[PDB]
C-alpha cells in the first residue's frame with residue numbers, strides 16, 4: 004500500500020492511497036517507509052466473490068452490472084489496482100566500486116605523511132583548536148576488533164567517548180558535524196522525543212489489546228554511531244537499562260506477554276553540561292558532572308571544554324563565522340578510505356605485550372601510591 | 376608494483392544455490408564411483 | 415546403473431520397478447554394513463537400543479549417508495515422499511531379522527533424517543522450493559491439542575512458528591508459517607520453545623485467499639519429518655565418563671573448567687560448580703516435602719567479572735533464562751492472565767520462573783529492581799510453586815528452578831569496615847533464601863596485577879580471529895547431563911552430634927555480631943551441599959569426606975560476612 008508523498012499533497016486535503024502488486028523477481032524489494040518510483044499499468048479488478056464456475060461457487064449505496072450467465076441474478080462491481088513490472092528508489096563490493104582513481108587515492112593516503120593530522124583537518128575543517136578532541140573522536144570511527152572466547156563468551160569491540168563543556172562552546176558542534184559526515188548514525192538526547200527513549204519499551208496494540216515492543220534509539224543505532232546530547236539529564240528507566248547496553252551490547256526484556264533478547268551493537272559519543280553551566284576549573288571532572296561512578300567507568304576517553312573571554316580569540320571566532328557566511332581530502336575520500344581500512348584485523352606483536360603490561364603496571368602502582 | 380601489494384595485503388586480511396552446490400558435489404562422487412565400478 | 419536419468423522426471427524414475435528395487439537394496443545394505451571410525455557397527459547398537467525401549471522410530475544422519483551412498487543422498491531432497499516410503503519398508507525387515515518377535519510391539523517403523531545441510535531462513539521461502547525437503551528455525555506461538563486423524567486413526571497436531579526475536583531487524587515485524595506433526599512427533603514441543611524443523615514444503619487451494627486478493631493464489635504448510643531443539647550417550651561416552659571418576663583429583667579438574675578465561679576467583683568457581691550439579695529433593699513420610707536446589711548470590715566492586723560469570727552459566731547449562739533489573743516485572747517473573755485471542759475467554763500463561771522449571775534462572779542488577787517486583791519470587795524460591803487466584807481462575811503451577819543473582823554494594827564500593835548486611839541493603843527474608851553467599855573485592859598487589867594483566871593480554875592474542883589441566887567443554891557438558899540423570903545420592907548415615915554442636919556454637923556467635931542471622935535453613939543447606947559433592951564423584955552414597963567438604967564451604971563463606979578486625983578472632987574460633 005502506497006500514499007501521496009509530502010511534496011504532492013494539496014493544502015487542506017486528506018491523502019489518497021493505492022494498492023500496488025509486485026511479481027516474480029521484484030518481490031520484497033521495498034519496505035514500509037521507503038519512497039520509490041514504480042513502472043507498470045493501471046488495471047480493473049472485479050469482485051471475485053459474486054462470480055460462479057464449474058470449479059467453485061459464488062460465496063454470497065450503489066449497483067453493479069447484470070446479465071451474465073456466470074453471475075446469475077447477482078450484480079458485479081470493480082476496483083482499481085496498479086500492476087508494477089519494476090520498482091526503484093526515488094569484501095568484493097570494494098573491488099567492484101573502486102576504479103583506478105579511487106585505488107590511487109587510497110594508495111596515496113596510505114603513503115601520506117602526517118596522515119593523522121591531514122585527516123583531522125579534512126574531516127573537521129570548521130573547528131578551531133582542540134586537536135586532542137579531534138584525534139580522539141577520529142579514532143572512534145576505526146573501532147576495534149571483536150573477539151569470541153572459546154567457551155562462547157565475547158569481548159567488546161567499540162570504544163565510547165564523552166565530552167563535557169560549557170553551553171556556550173564547542174561540544175555541540177562535534178556531535179552535529181560527525182552526524183552530518185557519517186553513514187548510518189543517530190542523533191538524540193537524554194530528554195528523548197518518544198515513549199521508547201534510548202532503549203526498547205512495551206506498548207499495547209489496540210488491534211488486539213496485545214503487548215508488543217517498540218524500538219529505542221540504541222536499537223536503531225545498531226552497527227552504527229550514536230550521538231546523545233544533554234546526557235547529564237536523563238530518565239532513570241533508561242539509565243538502568245544503559246548499564247547492560249554499554250558493555251553487553253544487548254537489551255533484555257521480561258514482562259507480560261513479551262520475553263526477548265535484543266541487539267544494541269553501537270559506538271556512543273556523549274555530550275554533557277557541568278553543574279552551574281560553567282566548568283569549575285579548580286575541581287575534578289567527577290566533582291563537576293552529574294553522572295554516577297558505574298556509568299562514568301564505562302567510557303574509554305573523557306574531554307573537557309570551557310570558555311574564557313579573550314578579546315583576540317573572540318574577534319578571530321567572529322571573523323571566522325562572518326567570513327564563512329560571506330563565501331586536502333574530500334568527505335568521500337575519507338568515506339572510501341575508512342571503508343577500505345576497516346577490513347584490516349591487525350595482531351599485537353610479542354614485544355608489544357611487554358610494553359603494554361609494563362605501562363598498565365606503572366599506571367596501577369601510581370594509582371596505588373596516590374580507581375583503576 | 377606497490378598498489379598491487381596493497382591490494383594483496385588488503386585481500387589477505389579480508390535461493391536454490393545450496394541445492395545446486397550439493398548436487399554438483401554428489402554428482403562428482405557419482406561419476407567417480409560409477410567409473411571405478413565400470414572398470 | 416541407477417544414475418541413468420533419461421526420458422523421465424526423477425519422481426517417475428523412482429516409481430519404476432528396477433530403480434525402486436535398487437534403492438531398496440542399497441539402503442538395506444547400508445544399514446547392515448555402516449561402520450564408525452573405530453570399526454564398530456553403528457546401526458546394530460542403535461537398533462538394539464530402539465528395540466529394548468519399545469520406541470519405534472529410527473534416526474539417520476544425512477552426512478554419512480551421503481559419504482557412503484551419494485546417489486541416494488542426491489535423489490532424497492528432490493523426491494522426499496518417494497524415497498522416505500522406500501526407506502520405511504527397508505528398515506522394518508532389518509529390525510525383524512535381528513528381533514523376530516518385534517512385530518508383536520509394532521507393525522511400522524518411521525525413518526527420520528537429520529543434519530540436512532541446506533538450511534533456509536523462514537522469510538526466504540519461494541515457489542522455487544515447493545515439494546522439496548527443507549530445514550528452518552523459529553519459536554512456537556500457537557499449538558493445538560492432540561487430535562485423532564483418519565487413515566485406522568493416528569495422532570495429529572498443528573503449530574505456528576515465527577522468526578526468533580532479535581533476528582528480525584530493529585522496529586520491523588516477523589514472518590511466520592504453519593506446520594503439521596503426526597504420530598510420534600506430537601508433544602515434541604510446547605509454546606515458547608525454540609526449535610529446528612526439517613520437513614516437506616507443500617501447498618493447496620483456498621477460496622478465502624482467492625476472494626480476499628482477487629487473484630488465484632494458494633496457501634502453504636510444512637510437513638514435519640524431524641524436530642529438535644537448538645540422553646543419547648554412546649557406550650564410549652559412558653565409558654570415558656565413568657573412567658574419569660577414578661581420578662582422586664577430579665574435583666580440581668571440574669572446578670578449574672568453569673568460565674576458563676576468567677583469571678583467579680577460586681571460591682566463585684567452586685560455588686557455581688556445586689550449584690550446577692545440585693542436591694536431591696525428598697518427601698519423608700509423604701507429608702513433608704523439601705527442595706533440592708542450591709541458590710547463589712554474588713556481590714562486590716565494579717569491574718570484577720560478575721556479569722561475565724552469568725553469561726558463561728547461561729551458555730554451558732540447558733533450560734537457561736537471563737534477565738536484568740528494571741527490565742522485568744512481578745507478573746513477567748511469575749505468571750499472567752489474558753483474554754485469549756481466538757477462544758475469547760480468560761486464560762493463564764507461564765512467566766519466567768515457570769518457563770524455566772527444572773533449569774537455571776539468572777538475574778542481573780538485582781539491586782535495582784522495584785521492591786514490589788523483587789518480592790514476587792519468595793514462594794518460588796522456597797515452596798517451589800506459584801499460586802494464583804484471579805479472574806475466576808484458582809490454580810497453582812510448578813517452579814522447580816535454581817536462582818542465581820548478582821548485586822552491587824551500597825554507594826558503589828564494598829567497605830571492609832562494615833558487615834555484609836550493612837553493605838548490601840536486602841531484608842532477612844530475602845538473604846536467608848540463598849544457599850551460597852560471596853563477596854568480591856579489589857586488591858592492589860603488584861605481582862598479582864602483573865600476572866592478571868599478562869594473562870589478559872595473552873587471552874587477547876590467543877582468541878584473535880586468526881592448577882590442573884581443564885576438560886574440553888563438550889566433555890564437561892556430557893559429564894553434567896550424565897551425572898544429573900543416572901546418579902541419586904543416598905544419605906544413609908552421618909554424625910549428628912558433630913553437626914549439632916557446631917550449629918549451636920555457630921548460631922550463638924551469629925547472634926553476637928549480627929552480620930547475618932543463622933536459622934534452621936542452614937542445616938538443610940549443608941545436607942544439599944554434601945549430596946552435591948557426592949554427585950560430582952558419581953557416588954551413590956554420601957560419605958565422611960562429603961560432610962567435611964560441606965562444612966568447609968559453609969564456614970568459609972560465613973567468615974567473610976564479618977568486619978575486617980573481627981575476622982581473625984572468628985577464624986580462630988571456628989578452627990577446621
Ligand SMILES: Nc1ncnc2c1ncn2[C@@H]1O[C@H](COP(=O)(O)OP(=O)(O)NP(=O)(O)O)[C@@H](O)[C@H]1O
Pocket residue numbers: 158159250297675676677678715716717718719720721722723870
Ligand atoms: N579477571 C578478569 N579476567 C578477564 N576479564 C576480566 C576480569 N575482570 C574483569 N574483566 C573484564 O572486564 C569487563 C567487565 O566485566 P563485568 O562482568 O561486567 O564486571 P562487573 O564487575 O560485573 N562490572 P559491573 O557490572 O559494572 O559491576 C569484561 O570485559 C570482563 O571480561
Ligand SMILES: [Mg+2]
Pocket residue numbers: 717719720721722
Ligand atoms: Mg558486570
